Amino acid sequence: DHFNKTILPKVMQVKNFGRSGRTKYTH
Amino acid sequence: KVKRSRKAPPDGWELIEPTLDELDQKMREAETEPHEGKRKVESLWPIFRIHHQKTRYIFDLFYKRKAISRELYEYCIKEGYADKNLIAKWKKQGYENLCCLRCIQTRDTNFGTNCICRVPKSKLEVGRIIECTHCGCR
Amino acid sequence: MIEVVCNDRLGKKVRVKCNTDDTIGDLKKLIAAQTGTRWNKIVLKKWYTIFKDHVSLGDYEIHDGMNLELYYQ
Amino acid sequence: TKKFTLMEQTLPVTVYEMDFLADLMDNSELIRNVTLCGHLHHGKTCFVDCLIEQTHPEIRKRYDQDLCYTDILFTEQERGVGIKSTPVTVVLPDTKGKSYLFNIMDTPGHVNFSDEVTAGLRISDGVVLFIDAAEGVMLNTERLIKHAVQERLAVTVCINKIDRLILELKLPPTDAYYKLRHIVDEVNGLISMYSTDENLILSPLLGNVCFSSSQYSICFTLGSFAKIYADTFGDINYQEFAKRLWGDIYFNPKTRKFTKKAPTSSSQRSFVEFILEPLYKILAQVVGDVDTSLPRTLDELGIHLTKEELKLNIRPLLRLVCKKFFGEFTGFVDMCVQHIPSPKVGAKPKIEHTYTGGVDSDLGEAMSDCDPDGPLMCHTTKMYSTDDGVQFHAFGRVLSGTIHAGQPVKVLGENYTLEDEEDSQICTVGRLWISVARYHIEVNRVPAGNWVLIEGVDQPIVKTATITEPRGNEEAQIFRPLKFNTTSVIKIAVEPVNPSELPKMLDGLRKVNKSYPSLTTKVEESGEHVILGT
Amino acid sequence: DPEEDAPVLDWFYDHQPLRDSRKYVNGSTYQRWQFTLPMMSTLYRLANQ
Amino acid sequence: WRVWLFFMRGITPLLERWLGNLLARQFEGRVESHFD
Amino acid sequence: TEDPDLPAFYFDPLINPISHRHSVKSQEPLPDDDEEFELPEFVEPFLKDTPLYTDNTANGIALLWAPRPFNLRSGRTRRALDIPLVKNWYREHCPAGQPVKVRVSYQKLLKYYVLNALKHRPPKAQKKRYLFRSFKATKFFQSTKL
RNA sequence: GUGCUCGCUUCGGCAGCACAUAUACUAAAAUUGGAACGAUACAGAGAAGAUUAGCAUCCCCUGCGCAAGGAUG
RNA sequence: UGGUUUCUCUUCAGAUCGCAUAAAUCUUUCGCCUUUUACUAAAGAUUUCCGUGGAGAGGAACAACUCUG
RNA sequence: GGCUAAGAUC
RNA sequence: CUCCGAACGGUAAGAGCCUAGCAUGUAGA
């Protein structure tokens, strides 16, 4: 969480080949 | 022990208060008895023996002596002083001194019959000092 | 603040976030708050190296993500 | 048949289909062609179901959900507004009650669906409209009053949903008569726009107002409630001297005097002391205390309620106690006296406003009896559809004639029936019968007055058309098309997704133009198929 | 209080009369239960919160 | 309480098939070439 | 009803009243009253006017407009795992303010409200019953109460 | 054991009538034979390969497997 | 005509059988993907389980209180 | 003894 | 803005010695 995660291109939630959940928590 | 109703039991309960307390203290001391001495099912024998004497005290006070009121009789059967099924089997003329309600079950025996508890000694064999393992006595 | 993951055997694996200068006695209180045992009966181990009860986390160089094999005493 | 509802194995009826239904269609003096209009949701389609439950022994009433049998379309049951009128023919007895043909047609009441009302009003005779007693007049009530009086038809108001004034507002009965008089003054005040019925004023003393409750199955007309009073050991000359319970005040001293004076300081009118006072009391006795004094009020009013009916909820027990008390809807005796002027006998201005003259050849011919006119005098004004959607069915009231099965009819079109005869396209109409809400009769003959569902003569018909026999017709003037009294201002274009299905959308736009009258599909010059809507 | 909750005094306090009341009999082994009009009227006052 | 009572209501038909074989092993003891 | 001091049927102050109610001119006795003066009447009215209007009216009418649990006069079995007690204000457009936690919690609770009713609506046929009742009829189990 | 016999017939009892008809891998037992890849001490995965591969034609263990994996002729 | 209950067992359930609602399987779809199971939810139909509804059969409690007619 | 890319093959 | 993951793919490979928590309830003379 030390990164700002806004300069990053679209989204990087988990880069470990296990993204079952597809959410960003705005809806 | 907690009465588990808190509903102001009527008259006659104080007349049967120390008698039922002595039977309840006997069963609680029998429940705290260790498993030593009893072979396999002999430890459950004082559990039914204290339960048989507890049902005989309420039934004699209601049917035989007829001193207790019916309102105190229904409060005693609801609080757990005596089982309603044990008093129902004793109402019939065919069974008045039955050992336990488990011995009267027809599906309990492997051969599909009754136990030795519900059998008179004159109709039985000559040499037999057997006791009912499920019920507890004859 | 390092996120030490006290990952023992048989499913007991929890995350424990503690300060760098925090002592190991404060870490066992946080590890017991996620595992459900007494903090006095928890012994942390890393290949037969039983940790002490008075040494800070900054002395062991336990960085973020440095997992520990939890055991019970 | 997953398009609309239909019959269910020929459901029975208290009226005989041959001894009573066949004889009523021949007698033109007892026809009573009516058409209900109502407001948007004033309980008109549900009220026709109450007449079915009073006539048919099909007990499927409002136990949990409603029993709207007039709305046959599946979209009408899902949306709940109804987009198609359905003619209903049943046997509603009067107070004497021998037999009435009761040619009714329940039209929807949405403001955009005014074209279906103008099709039914220009075809039927009776214009008995329903007003919700909770809201009063509305936008649909003002447009229907101007449309009915301009068509030279009758008028008879009926304050429906009268249970909302007691069970949903808790209004006092003294103020309820002041509110009910505000409706009748506003309805008669709105009726004073077309100055042609100044002697025909809508009033409950003249038998025009007919109280009812479509939600809870009640009827409190002045003729019917007096007959229910005299039946309960009254013997006080029902419908002969009981026409004084409006404005007059009864008094227990001088009990044989319905004077107009006010003896006591708190003594309301006779309507709020003999009619609305028990009606507020009977609803309060069942919905207020169902465990105490409920059989006491039922035995005092003479209502033998069984133990199974006593074990119901508060809503169906209120409807079952009212149905056992009132019973048959005898309130339409006032709707047969003040209204329903017996078509083919007293329908002389009806043919004068529909046909384009036709003096000495068709004016005296169509105003004559059913049989001896001869060229069948047919005029359809609504094109229904079957379960397949392809084969259409016509619907119209025969003015004077009888073409049963064999005789074909030249389908006189809208523009192809003038002195310059363009096309007729005559065909044999052999599948003509009488229609109901859900069931469908199978009749051979078809006299005047009744609504005939002619089949097979609807393919060269795109709008309200006429049908006459080609056996010597003198080519009279055809009927005028139905003015919808509302211009379809909204226009939405429609084009298929795949462009290869161009005649498939063109054939569907032609069939949709025959169903809805106001839908005038005008093909634009740019090739875009437009559709005008309300 | 025994002023507004009078018909629901003893019935709304335990689970054994909730299914085996046997007063205005309601199917003693937890069957279809039938109540009165002020019995459900005092019920709706507590459920309105 | 409602969600986790339904969790055991779905696992009670499940776990008899999940752990049914686990309690049973302690007493029972456990391409295109085909077309050519 | 705001308070049970008002009577059974009462003209509520939150009702737009009838303004005139004097459109007719009948200060003098009408000639229809003298015409109906030869109409006698001595019988009882259409209902027995021995009681009043109503005693328990405010409690009874409000119970009629009550929702599905508080309106039926015949209580069924209705298992404790079948009375949700949370969907009464879940599918109701609840939040007046704006919490960020309440928005997705109301959206997800309404999601499983639809999804358990959209495709999960079978006729629910079955053939078997009495699973644990077969164990009670065995020769080894025994029933008691504790 | 429970209730009754116009029984002996006292009312202390006896005899008869009616109901109740076969529980129990039987014991608080007797012995009988042994398994950690578990610690400790010894040396410490070679500091080095010329056939080029799979598919089907008999069983133990991990796992909940109508997924899967090791060993196999 | 004549019985309020309670427990056992025999069918069909096309009624929100359930005014509320779980899991697994099969055939198609998406996201991650690195071997696999545990994965995300859109459609449809097959079981299991939590339960229930009318109608005959056998026991117990006042069946006698006399219920409707 | 069959199917596998004259099975690829100096 | 608060959507929190678990196992397998992993510790080898062996030599001599040492000690343990376990299980069956028999027909026979």
Ligand SMILES: Nc1nc2c(ncn2[C@@H]2O[C@H](COP(=O)(O)OP(=O)(O)OP(=O)(O)O)[C@@H](O)[C@H]2O)c(=O)[nH]1
């Ligand atoms: N509770 C109650 N509801 C009523 C009563 N009368 C009418 N309604 C309601 O009013 C609604 C309107 O009646 P509909 O059957 O739809 O007929 P309609 O008034 O012509 O309305 P549309 O069909 O939409 O044209 C019905 O659905 C009823 O729910 C009543 O007396 N009591």
Ligand SMILES: [Mg+2]
């Ligand atoms: Mg309608």
